A paper describes a structure:
Next, we obtained crystal structures for the different peptides bound to COP1 (1.3–2.0 Å resolution, see Tables EV1 and EV2, and EV4) to compare their peptide binding modes. We found that all peptides bind in a similar configuration with the VP forming the center of the binding site (r.m.s.d. between the different peptides range from ~ 0.3 to 1.5 Å, comparing 5 or 6 corresponding Cα atoms). Chemically diverse amino acids (Tyr/Arg/Gln) map to the −3 and −2 position and often deeply insert into the COP1 binding cleft, acting as anchor residues. This suggests that the COP1 WD40 domain has high structural plasticity, being able to accommodate sequence‐divergent VP‐containing peptides.
COP1 contains an N‐terminal zinc finger, a central coiled‐coil, and a C‐terminal WD40 domain, which is essential for proper COP1 function (Deng et al, 1992; McNellis et al, 1994).
Residue numbers in the entry:
A (entry chain A): 347 to 363, 372 to 407, 411 to 631, 643 to 675
B (entry chain B): 241 to 247
The structure:
Amino acid sequence: AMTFTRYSRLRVIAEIRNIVSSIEFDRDDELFATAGVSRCIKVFDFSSVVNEPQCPIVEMSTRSKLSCLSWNKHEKNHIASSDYEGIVTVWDVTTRQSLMEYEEHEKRAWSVDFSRTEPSMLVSGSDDCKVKVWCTRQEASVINIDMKANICCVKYNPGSSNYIAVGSADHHIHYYDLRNISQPLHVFSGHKKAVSYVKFLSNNELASASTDSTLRLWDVKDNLPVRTFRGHTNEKNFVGLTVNSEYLACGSETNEVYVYHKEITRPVTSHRFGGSYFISAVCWKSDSPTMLTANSQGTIKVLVLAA
Amino acid sequence: HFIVPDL
């Protein structure tokens, strides 16, 4: 542990005082956005939040509760949302307008992700058991994958828009090459409950979270299990997962944020937010020790790993 | 609620 980590705690550097299901930084880690049950996407300036004692710079009202946000990796001002009606919307945060409203899903969509390398491409997953790939220049889905169970999370590989990880209520991660969707490249078994999040640390390193109270690390080059992380409590809710090159962070039903170094199976540190509440969203500020977090009361905290 | 589907 000593060899890999130099941190022992998380410091609170800001707090903005109603579940927040998603908290995400824009392309430049300059703005961040929150969304959830209140049917409003709120955008904040990170530096203002850190420096000052708090008001969003943009708010966009929605027709449905929001489950996930994903900022565009090329168009700074564009952000996608998924909602409880199944609608996947692309918004412009400067004009406040919906640019695209994709309505093919028949049930709640739990997740949306904009590709980093082909930034007009976005993927969504839904309780309707479908994965849909969309292009911002086309109204109809480009790819549709019919699966056997509810899809809880979708994520593009950070190095290529040809690969997506799909976390399913069937307990497995289905890893697809979108150039041939007749069969996944590989299906990763190991979780004992639904897979609620999938996030990549790098081109070849995939992390997942599950309501079996574990995170897991997987090698998508050689299709291997790597490591299981334990300590947090997650038996029921979407509690958030975020990863960077070295660290994984997740929420807990004990109203605590947990941090793991990818080489160590038990936590580096944890933070009690302050059972009755659960952490509901987390997001690293790229490869830095700074993180955004939010809980089921709608409180937002900026945390920083510290010695 | 934000309960993860299972079964």
